Amino acid sequence: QFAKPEDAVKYRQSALTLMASHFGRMTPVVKGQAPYDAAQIKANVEVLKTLSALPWAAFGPGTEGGDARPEIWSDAASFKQKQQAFQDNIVKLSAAADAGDLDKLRAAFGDVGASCKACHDAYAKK
Amino acid sequence: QFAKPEDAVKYRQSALTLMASHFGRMTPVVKGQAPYDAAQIKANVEVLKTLSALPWAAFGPGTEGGDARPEIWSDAASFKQKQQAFQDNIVKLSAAADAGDLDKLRAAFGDVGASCKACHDAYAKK
Ligand code: HEC
Ligand code: HEC
Numbered sequence A, B: 001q002f003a004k005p006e007d008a009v010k011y012r013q014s015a016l017t018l019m020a021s022h023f024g025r026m027t028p029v030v031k032g033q034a035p036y037d038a039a040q041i042k043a044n045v046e047v048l049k050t051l052s053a054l055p056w057a058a059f060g061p062g063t064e065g066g067d068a069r070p071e072i073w074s075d076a077a078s079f080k081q082k083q084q085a086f087q088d089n090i091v092k093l094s095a096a097a098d099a100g101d102l103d104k105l106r107a108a109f110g111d112v113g114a115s116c117k118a119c120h121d122a123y124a125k126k
Helices: A005-024 A038-052 A076-099 A102-123 B005-024 B038-052 B076-099 B102-123
Strands: none
Touching (some): A005 A102, B005 B038, B038 B076
16 A cells, blocks of 8 residues: 555554554553543553554565664564564453453553563664 | 643644555545455455544644644634544445445545545645
């Protein structure tokens, strides 16, 4: 869907910005600093689910640019493992949200965050 | 979810960028320049549905900035009519996609596009 590599870069950066907001806005809730409304969180995690599937198709070959490290492309398999594993942590977060299980939500939220950082430390430029 | 108005601006711009890509990538399909795969289009319009609900909550009072015209805030009701009407055009597009009805998809796509432009001509800076 991208006319030039720059369009893929802009798309993925925008998608990642939106995940970050839908993930990070729950921090006060998981810390207990803001109240826990199970329905609110269920709905927000559904949005996050949708968004978390979107970036990867915008790292399609030849789309070097942005702050993407080149290693995304020279080992397609390891990067794919990374994103698929991240998405499966999102599945655990969805399960916790759908169950209205706060304890499970806290644990899943931490594991998701660790997954974000694991990818950045291998694949995003400093 | 925004610490400063700039964060709302960045969110909405990113959300709008993603809609634009999920909307515009269907142009070749509705023109017949690319093939019509009903399942592909159904799935893409579901993504567009999700995305098309997101920008509006990031124009929450005091978030002047970006290329948003000030009139978004001085008449909350007219802007709301605009976004809600846009979202209902998205509903028609979803119905057409879910039905696998190409003719309906073409018509709905044009009406969605007109709705985007109607909002821009009142509420986005040139
Ligand atoms: C690899 C499998 C990743 C996972 C999982 C997550 N992110 Fe990431 N992110 C990744 C790359 C390669 C990049 C650079 C993209 C580019 O081309 O520049 C990024 C970038 C971001 C950004 C900045 C986006 C921008 O505006 O430029 C943010 C805010 C971000 N990532 C957030 C984020 C969060 C919160 C994640 C887990 C919920 C997450 N990312 C996962 C690679 C990967
Ligand atoms: C009002 C109800 C709108 C409707 C419907 C659509 N858009 Fe729009 N758009 C609107 C505003 C007020 C702005 C400015 C936002 C800001 O603070 O700068 C925009 C902007 C965009 C952009 C640019 C985003 C960026 O990267 O800065 C794009 C690509 C865009 N809009 C696309 C777009 C499409 C394709 C729409 C219909 C499918 C659509 N918008 C509807 C207001 C409104």
